[PDB]
């Protein structure tokens, strides 16, 4: 029994290893479109590089997302990128301690304290992780309005891998309860 509940917390955090890093590498967070005078181009911007598709070619003309942001919201944005690196790191610190939940690892003796430290390493990660997306979105709401130089999207809609960004935070909380109800029963 205790092998299966411990395997479930590792398998969910392995998805949180996948979903949060799939969101972090992709640049498809906000699928916007921009007309020029009627000719609309479709684009997508992530956290680092804003790449728009040119009309009928290779496309992907990539501006860095940093310098286009306004000056007050730029150092606000760095606190999102600092915390997002602090999110992926503390999930790997969380997930590698889930590998010590395996009894093929170290021991039974003081291993139960390793699992009490384990969900804490995922909960204190996900709390910093949810804010790191909340810190991103309120910056992006400004850049639709007034921030950059005269490119303003027709749509500010969240694309894919932003739903994958919440799902890793969802899987961090679903895995932390799996290692804690088996901590009691």
């Amino acid at each position: 029994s205790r092998r299966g509940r411990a395997l479930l917390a590792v398998a969910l955090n392995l998805l949180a290893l996948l979903f949060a890093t799939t969101a972090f590498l992709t640049t498809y967070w906000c699928q916007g479109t921009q007309r020029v005078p009627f000719q609309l181009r479709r684009f997508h911007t992530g956290i680092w590089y804003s790449c728009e598709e040119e009309l009928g070619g290779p496309g992907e003309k990539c501006r860095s997302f940093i310098d286009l942001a306004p000056a007050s919201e730029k150092g606000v944005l760095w606190l999102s990128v600092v915390s997002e690196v602090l999110y992926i790191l503390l999930l790997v610190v969380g997930f590698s301690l889930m590998c010590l939940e395996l009894l093929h690892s170290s021991s039974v003796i003081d291993g139960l304290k390793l699992n009490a430290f384990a969900a804490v390493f995922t909960v204190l990660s996900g709390l910093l992780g949810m804010v790191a997306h909340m810190m991103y979105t309120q910056v992006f709401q400004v850049t639709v309005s007034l921030g950059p130089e005269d490119w303003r999207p027709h749509s500010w809609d969240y694309g894919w891998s932003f739903c994958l960004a919440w799902g890793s935070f969802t899987c961090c909380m679903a895995a932390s309860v799996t290692t804690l109800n088996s901590y009691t029963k």
Binding site: A119, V120, V123, L127, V177, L180, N181, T184
Partner: protein
């Protein structure tokens, strides 16, 4: 986080399971409350801060719905 705290030195019998910790928070968010209440300090903070979250969001909901229905009450379509 309320479930995570109540399995440590917050004890006696641990009642705040994950099927109960969702039911306290949903009772706190709809302002109905439940008979259960956190008894340790680290449970009273997570039960305390979430109260201040549901006080602002509900009061922001009622006021903004009073903002739609006042501006819609003032549209006054063209009479002359």
């Amino acid at each position: 986080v309320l479930f995570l705290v109540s399995r440590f030195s917050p004890y006696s019998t641990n009642e705040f399971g994950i099927f109960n910790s969702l039911w306290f928070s949903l009772g706190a968010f709809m302002q109905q409350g439940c008979d259960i209440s956190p008894r340790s300090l680290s449970g009273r903070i997570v039960g305390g801060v979430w109260w201040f979250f549901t006080l602002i969001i509900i009061s922001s909901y009622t006021a903004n719905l009073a903002a739609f229905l006042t501006v819609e009450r003032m549209v006054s379509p063209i009479e002359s």
